[PDB]
Structure 1
Amino acid sequence: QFMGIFEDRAPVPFEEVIDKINAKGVCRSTAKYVRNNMETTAFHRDDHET
């Protein structure tokens, strides 16, 4: 049973835009962003950064 689904939209940092997406065509698998005045990190698939 689903007991809660926190869905948020995090921004993509600049250095992840120019260096990664615009240049290499890839995007990081971890979202690091400031939300509710705290620095939060979300690791995709509870795994390493990729």
Structure 2
Amino acid sequence: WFGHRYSQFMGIFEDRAPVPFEEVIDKINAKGVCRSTAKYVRNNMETT
């Protein structure tokens, strides 16, 4: 929340997302890179 002369965290949602198998093989192990996006199933929903 951006108030006048101050900013405050209304919330901080912190999650740990698994890296998909194809990203571990093709990106991390082959090129040493990760996608900047996290696409995973959390709480029976696909979240990106």
Fold match by TM threshold 0.5: yes
Question: RMSD over aligned Cα, in angstroms?
Answer: 0.3
Query: What residue is the counterpart of 1:47 in the other structure?
Result: none
Greater RCO (Cα-Cα under 8 Å, separation 6 or more): 1
Q: In 1, distance between residues paired with 2:33 and 2:25?
A: 11
Unaligned 5+ residue runs, structure 2? Answer: 1-7
The alpha-carbon deviation at position 29 of structure 1 amounts to 0.2
Q: Which runs of 4+ in 1 moved over 4 A?
A: none
* Larger gyration radius, structure 1 or structure 2: 2
Identical counterparts, % of pairs: 100
SS in 2 for 1:31: coil
Q: What do the CA deviations read for 1:7-45 (whole angstroms, capped 9, x no partner)?
A: 00000000000000000010000000000000000xxxx
Residue matched to 1:12: 19
Runs of 5+ unmatched residues, structure 1: 42-50
Aligned residues, how many?
Answer: 41
Instruction: Calculate the TM-score normalised by the size of structure 1.
Output: 0.81
TM-score where L is the length of structure 2: 0.84
